Every structure is written in C-alpha cells, then in structure tokens.
Amino acid sequence: MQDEQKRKEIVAEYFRKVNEGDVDAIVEMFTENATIEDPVGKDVREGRAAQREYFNSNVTAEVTIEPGHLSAGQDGKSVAVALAAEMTNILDPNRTRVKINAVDVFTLTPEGKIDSMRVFWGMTDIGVW
Amino acid sequence: MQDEQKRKEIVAEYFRKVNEGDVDAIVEMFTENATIEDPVGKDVREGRAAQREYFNSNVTAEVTIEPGHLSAGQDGKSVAVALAAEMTNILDPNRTRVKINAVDVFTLTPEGKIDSMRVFWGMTDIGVWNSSSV
C-alpha cells in the first residue's frame, strides 16, 4: 500500500502468519514473482516455487518471530524492521532452539502485496540460550 | 570490512561519533562519493559536500542516536540496525524532543569505509517525548 499505516499492517500480518505456520496464507501475501534474499548476499529466491520452499523450510524449522518497531520508508512501498527469530535446525537431533537477530526490509505493491523481502543476518547474529 | 565483527564495530563507532557531534570525524568515515539517502524515498545525497550539509544539520538538531542490535548482511559489506533518534522539537524546543524510530542500512568498503546509508523512517515513525522535568 502507499499509505504507511496500511503498508505496516500488511507486514504485521505477514509475521502473524509466519507464526501461525500456514504456508498457503503466507505465500498468497507475496506477488507471484516476488524475490526473497535471505540472507542478504546469498542466492535470490524468485517466484512461487522458491517462496514455497522457503516458507516450508521456515515452518518446518518451527520459526517464531518477535518483530520490533515497523519503520516505513517514504517511497510509497518500503517497511524495514528488526526482529528476533527463533528456530530449530531439523537436522539437529537435540532440536536446539536458536535465536537470530535480523533486519527485514520489504517492499509492497500499491494493492498491498509483498514484492521483495531482504533479510539481513550474519553468522555473528546467532545465539543459543 | 568483510569480517562481520569488524564491519559491525565500525558502525558502532559511527553512532558514537554521531553522538559526540564531531562532524570532521564522522564525514571521514565515509568514502568520497558515498550516498546518504534519508529518508529512503526522498533521496539521495551524494558527495563529500552534502555529507557536511547532513552531519552539520544533525548536530544543529541536537541529534542523539540509540542503536539496537547491529545485524550483518552476508554480502561482505552490509550492516543493518534499528535505532531511536531523538532531536530538537521546533514546535516546542524547550519542553519536548522529537523521537524517530528508524532503520539504518550501511554498506561498507573492504577498507572499512561507509559507501552508502539508507535510513528508513516515515511520518508514522515520529513521536513527541517529554524533555525536561523543569
């Protein structure tokens, strides 16, 4: 959306749906050709198949997100927000929960669909206990 | 810097120097043709010059920054951080401060210098806060 408030509300709803773990509902928030860059500097994920794989991987990892303040850009489409993500590695037989402190930047269409997400987190943004 | 900890330590210094009000020292942390886009979307300063227009008006605005956690990109150069910036309230200079909740994204050089900064904040990211207990 181009209205800041409404734009933020769509991102808030995205995090609610990540938390709910409902892949189909999450994927439908994105445009069909939306790109996801997670982490920033690795391979860009592009289109529906890649989104699906990425969100299945997140729900499988039992991700929970606690978002910080949602900041709007003044470009009619961006939202940027620091978050704490917690998740489990499904290959770890101890299923140990890890925290990642990340920053997400979204851009949205004027109809309110997400068309890019970039996720900043590095090796040194990961914590345990 | 390509090493995440080093890259972060540099941005940590940037905020320290901003809070110190030392325009000389701040401007220097940038490269010659660094772009500062603040706010994102009403772009886009470029150049050693406009970085002094920039840093001088921050000092004039009595800006203080409280950064949160510094996250790194895995692109060998980005740092991204949510912060709270407080400054003078011109509508009520003496009684209140304006607070903006923003996200900064920096990209840095392999030497340690800032090439770009995009500061995300909107009209809905501004609060007014009590400033004195007179």
Residue numbers in the entry:
A (entry chain A): 1 to 129
B (entry chain B): 1 to 134
Sentences from the paper on this structure:
The enzyme SalBIII from the salinomycin biosynthetic pathway resembles other polyether epoxide hydrolases/cyclases of the MonB family, but SalBIII plays no role in the conventional cascade of ring opening/closing. Using this metabolite in vitro as a substrate analogue, SalBIII has been shown to form pyran ring A. We have determined the X-ray crystal structure of SalBIII, and structure-guided mutagenesis of putative active-site residues has identified Asp38 and Asp104 as an essential catalytic dyad. The demonstrated pyran synthase activity of SalBIII further extends the impressive catalytic versatility of α+β barrel fold proteins.
